[PDB]
TrEMBL record:
InterPro entries, alphabetized: DHFR, DHFR-like_dom_sf, DHFR_CS, DHFR_dom
Annotated catalysed reactions: (6S)-5,6,7,8-tetrahydrofolate + NADP(+) = 7,8-dihydrofolate + NADPH + H(+)
Pfam families, per the entry: DHFR_1 (PF00186)
Family statement drawn from the similarity comment of this UniProt entry: Belongs to the dihydrofolate reductase family.
Protein name, UniProt field: Dihydrofolate reductase
Native source organism of the sequence: Mycobacterium tuberculosis
Described function: Key enzyme in folate metabolism. Catalyzes an essential reaction for de novo glycine and purine synthesis, and for DNA precursor synthesis.
Pathway: Cofactor biosynthesis; tetrahydrofolate biosynthesis; 5,6,7,8-tetrahydrofolate from 7,8-dihydrofolate: step 1/1
Name of the top EC class for this enzyme: oxidoreductase
Length: 159
């Protein structure tokens, strides 16, 4: 199973300036629940976005995708192609925009946290991948984060 997990503004923005223009503790907890114990695959930029203190994310097989054959990520596997990372029963692609797009053909699950933030798209933004007609999606209720933003979860699947 390859799944994608991400949070996006309504506009499709997932990242800006190498970080995220919001912070939902509830989505972090949800993220941790969904990925705990499994392989997490991320682009090198996303690895860089992780604070050195949470790095590697505990209890998960941290894999970083880089074309740099000598890139050192203390506590992770650095692989130069996505196929090297799919060697576990459950693999979660955790970002960023490039790796989401690269992984979409392998995916059967997308766990999408939609953040009700009017965030117009800007040059350089990392974007959520486009899901075609093969994806079947079920939505949750709009919830309120303690950060003040509303959010809801879309769970997409396809065979
Ligand atoms: N909202 C959310 O849910 C999340 C948002 N984000 C945000 O996403 C943004 C980063 O995403 P993005 O900028 O797209 O970069 P990524 O995090 O997708 O990593 C990009 C890097 O991945 C490597 N890479 C990409 N394609 C390939 C390939 N085909 N073969 C080998 N290596 C490859 C390269 O690493 P190298 O350059 O070393 O070769 C590239 O620079 C940040 O702002 C981050 O905060 C991240 C995670 C979750
Ligand atoms: C910080 C964060 C949030 C948040 O703060 O809302 C939601 N996802 N992530 C996250 C970022 C990078 C990698 C994995 C997950
Ligand atoms: C996703 C995450 C976890 C986790 O999933 O265990 C623990 N810290 N963070 C985190 C990452 C980036 C920024 C803030 C927090
Ligand atoms: Co699990």
């Amino acid at each position: 199973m390859v799944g994608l997990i991400w949070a996006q503004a309504t506009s499709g923005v997932i990242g800006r300036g190498g970080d995220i223009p919001w912070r939902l503790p509830e989505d972090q907890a949800h993220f941790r629940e969904i990925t705990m114990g499994h392989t997490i695959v991320m682009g090198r930029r996303t690895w860089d976005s992780l604070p050195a203190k949470v790095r590697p994310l505990p209890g998960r097989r941290n894999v970083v995708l880089s074309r740099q054959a000598d890139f050192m990520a203390s506590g992770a596997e650095v692989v130069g192609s996505l196929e090297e990372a799919l060697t576990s029963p459950e693999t979660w692609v955790i970002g960023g925009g490039q790796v989401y797009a690269l992984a979409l053909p392998y995916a059967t699950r997308c766990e999408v946290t939609e953040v009700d933030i009017g965030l117009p798209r800007e040059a350089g933004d990392a974007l959520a991948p486009v899901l075609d007609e093969t994806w079947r999606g079920e939505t949750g209720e709009w919830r309120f984060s303690r950060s003040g933003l509303r959010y809801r979860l879309y769970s997409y699947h396809r065979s």
